[PDB]
Design a protein around this ligand. Structure first.
Ligand code: KF8
Ligand code: ZN
Ligand code: ZN
Ligand code: ZN
Ligand code: ZN
Lengths: 76, 69
């Protein structure tokens, strides 16, 4: 039905919001510290000197284990 | 249709996975450091001396700003 199409769109958008803002391919699993922005996968977070969202200096990156993780890279 | 019910269940489970594992009421927005388990809201994370997933000592809590918030 049309309701099925609406729910499919909601699911798609929620899943897309969990993807890295730089490569758009890998799940977000890294936090820039101390600002807290959690918007990148490990590879894209590795070489940024400043946060791509707020421009704060990145002192270090903290890996995050989220219950929503489903990709092979985060389960293996 | 039956697919509407299946999609409602998938959406409910994904939304539930974003809720605090302790209180089940607030969105996850905190990481236990250094282990990295990100499973609580700030109020439950403040009250735990040990990670509720791996039992490692919590040295400090890092707030996380997620695009899904
Ligand atoms: O009351 C709040 N949190 C509680 C609700 C019940 C579950 N444990 C946390 C709350 C959260 C954010 C800002 C202000 C108040
Ligand atoms: Zn990436
Ligand atoms: Zn930032
Ligand atoms: Zn909580
Ligand atoms: Zn832990």
């Amino acid at each position: 039905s049309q309701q099925t199409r609406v729910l499919q769109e909601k699911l798609r958008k929620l899943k897309e919001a969990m993807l890295c803002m730089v490569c758009c391919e890998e799940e977000i699993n890294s936090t820039f510290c101390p600002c807290g922005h959690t918007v990148c996968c490990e590879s894209c977070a590795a070489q940024l000197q400043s946060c791509p969202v707020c421009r704060s200096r990145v002192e270090h990156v903290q890996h995050v284990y989220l219950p929503t993780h489903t990709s092979l890279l985060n389960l293996t």
